[PDB]
Design an enzyme around this catalytic site. Sequence first.
Site, PDB file in Angstrom:
ATOM      1  N   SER A   1       4.915  -0.097  11.658  1.00  0.00           N
ATOM      2  CA  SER A   1       3.665   0.590  11.982  1.00  0.00           C
ATOM      3  C   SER A   1       3.633   2.111  11.723  1.00  0.00           C
ATOM      4  CB  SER A   1       3.243   0.240  13.416  1.00  0.00           C
ATOM      5  OG  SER A   1       4.377   0.219  14.266  1.00  0.00           O
ATOM      6  N   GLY A   2       2.435   2.601  11.388  1.00  0.00           N
ATOM      7  CA  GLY A   2       2.168   4.024  11.140  1.00  0.00           C
ATOM      8  C   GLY A   2       1.258   4.578  12.232  1.00  0.00           C
ATOM      9  N   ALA A   3       0.524   5.643  11.921  1.00  0.00           N
ATOM     10  CA  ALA A   3      -0.384   6.236  12.898  1.00  0.00           C
ATOM     11  C   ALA A   3      -1.525   5.280  13.317  1.00  0.00           C
ATOM     12  CB  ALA A   3      -0.920   7.582  12.409  1.00  0.00           C
ATOM     13  N   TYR A   4      -1.378   4.756  14.539  1.00  0.00           N
ATOM     14  CA  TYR A   4      -2.362   3.907  15.239  1.00  0.00           C
ATOM     15  C   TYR A   4      -2.599   2.493  14.684  1.00  0.00           C
ATOM     16  CZ  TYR A   4      -3.477   8.888  16.348  1.00  0.00           C
ATOM     17  OH  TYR A   4      -3.429  10.251  16.582  1.00  0.00           O
TER      18      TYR A   4
ATOM     19  N   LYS B   1      -2.898  -0.283   5.976  1.00  0.00           N
ATOM     20  CA  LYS B   1      -2.817  -0.172   7.411  1.00  0.00           C
ATOM     21  C   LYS B   1      -4.013  -0.823   8.085  1.00  0.00           C
ATOM     22  CE  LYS B   1      -3.123   4.030   9.115  1.00  0.00           C
ATOM     23  NZ  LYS B   1      -2.637   5.299   9.752  1.00  0.00           N
TER      24      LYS B   1
ATOM     25  N   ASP C   1      -0.271  12.023   7.565  1.00  0.00           N
ATOM     26  CA  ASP C   1      -0.570  12.216   9.002  1.00  0.00           C
ATOM     27  C   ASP C   1      -1.052  13.589   9.469  1.00  0.00           C
ATOM     28  OD1 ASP C   1      -0.189   9.476   9.700  1.00  0.00           O
ATOM     29  OD2 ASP C   1       1.979   9.799   9.945  1.00  0.00           O
TER      30      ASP C   1
HETATM   31  C1  LIG Z   1      -0.956   7.623   6.237  1.00  0.00           C
HETATM   32  C2  LIG Z   1      -1.467   6.254   5.936  1.00  0.00           C
HETATM   33  C3  LIG Z   1      -2.829   6.044   5.803  1.00  0.00           C
HETATM   34  C4  LIG Z   1      -3.311   4.787   5.523  1.00  0.00           C
HETATM   35  C5  LIG Z   1      -2.430   3.739   5.392  1.00  0.00           C
HETATM   36  C6  LIG Z   1      -1.067   3.930   5.531  1.00  0.00           C
HETATM   37  C7  LIG Z   1      -0.588   5.197   5.801  1.00  0.00           C
HETATM   38  C8  LIG Z   1       0.872   5.438   5.940  1.00  0.00           C
HETATM   39  O1  LIG Z   1       1.387   5.486   7.043  1.00  0.00           O
HETATM   40  C9  LIG Z   1       1.630   5.660   4.731  1.00  0.00           C
HETATM   41  C10 LIG Z   1       1.072   5.728   3.481  1.00  0.00           C
HETATM   42  N1  LIG Z   1       2.066   5.953   2.577  1.00  0.00           N
HETATM   43  C11 LIG Z   1       3.278   6.043   3.186  1.00  0.00           C
HETATM   44  C12 LIG Z   1       4.476   6.286   2.432  1.00  0.00           C
HETATM   45  O2  LIG Z   1       4.506   6.368   1.207  1.00  0.00           O
HETATM   46  N2  LIG Z   1       5.589   6.456   3.196  1.00  0.00           N
HETATM   47  C13 LIG Z   1       6.835   6.735   2.531  1.00  0.00           C
HETATM   48  C14 LIG Z   1       7.715   5.585   2.661  1.00  0.00           C
HETATM   49  C15 LIG Z   1       7.733   4.358   2.038  1.00  0.00           C
HETATM   50  C16 LIG Z   1       8.825   3.658   2.601  1.00  0.00           C
HETATM   51  C17 LIG Z   1       9.384   4.509   3.532  1.00  0.00           C
HETATM   52  O3  LIG Z   1       8.712   5.697   3.580  1.00  0.00           O
HETATM   53  C18 LIG Z   1       3.026   5.857   4.535  1.00  0.00           C
END
Ligand SMILES: Cc1ccccc1C(=O)c1c[nH]c(C(=O)NCc2ccco2)c1
Length: 347
Positions: free
Chosen positions: A29-32, A50, A165
């Site tokens: 999980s990510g933000a919310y 997400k 974020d």
């Molecule tokens: C910030 C966000 C908005 C909408 C949907 C998902 C997310 C999110 O948490 C996220 C988007 N991209 C990544 C990302 O590339 N993280 C780096 C990563 C990949 C595997 C481990 O770290 C996270």
Amino acid sequence: ERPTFYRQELNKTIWEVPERYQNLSPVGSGAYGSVCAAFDTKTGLRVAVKKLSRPFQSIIHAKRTYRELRLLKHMKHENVIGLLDVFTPARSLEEFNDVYLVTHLMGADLNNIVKCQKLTDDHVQFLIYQILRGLKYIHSADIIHRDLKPSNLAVNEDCELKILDFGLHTDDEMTGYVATRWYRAPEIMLNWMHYNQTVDIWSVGCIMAELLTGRTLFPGTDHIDQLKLILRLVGTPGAELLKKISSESARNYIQSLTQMPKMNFANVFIGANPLAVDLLEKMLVLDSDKRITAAQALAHAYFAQYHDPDDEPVADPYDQSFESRDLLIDEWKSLTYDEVISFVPPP
Ligand SMILES: Cc1ccccc1C(=O)c1c[nH]c(C(=O)NCc2ccco2)c1
């Protein structure tokens, strides 16, 4: 017009997504809300999808759903996570209850890079250059990140970086020996004053230090321990800063500490490029009024190799008059819907 959705159980809930998204795999999980990696067959991109967790359960939830969507819809910069897609299976407002957000999925975050390989000075230039370039953009839209740290930095196979974020923790999440607090500006950490975007430059200095040394710059075991780690390095506040600490309570605590001078950064950061030391002193200033800005930092000699004044863009204006608006659940919800409906994908 409306694509066809298919259903599947993932993360103990039903995900209902358009056909274009295939091979959904939970990635934590990510933000919310829960996140799945997916292959977007329409663009050929590896994406993060997400599903927002109960987006309209409370006013606080409804408004933050609206906020995240607004934020993601506005961001269009190479070094900032933008919105590739937003969707709902609902065919009308009456049945609107779920929001799905789709963005780039990069190989890893900065945490994994910082632990898993040695960083040359050039790698530090490129990475910090990229954070400051996205930050100039964010700040120009009058948005503050407030929570910049290596886990909010998405990095790919080629050290290309996106910030995540922005403009969004519990007192408990800020307690103890926790990374959630190691990159926080002292003024925000101990609520000294009305804070602004300069808090972000402080986090950048913490991150930069750590890329250069491989160690957390201020790994405090709690707020007070961390304050001491900070003051040892940058010195106790002078008369001029004390006046700006409008919390009389905090101002009084600060004043109980033995005064200390600013340490020599060349002896703290032994071996480091002198241009990097210089930039760190300009970012890690206790008086937030006097820190270098992102725009100013991009023009610092350390980034001579990457700096290009014609390719460091500003944002379009961001209207956040909604922040100070009092609305009911059904109104934040309607607003969110309109934002979903009117989404135009990137070109
Ligand atoms: C910030 C966000 C908005 C909408 C949907 C998902 C997310 C999110 O948490 C996220 C988007 N991209 C990544 C990302 O590339 N993280 C780096 C990563 C990949 C595997 C481990 O770290 C996270």
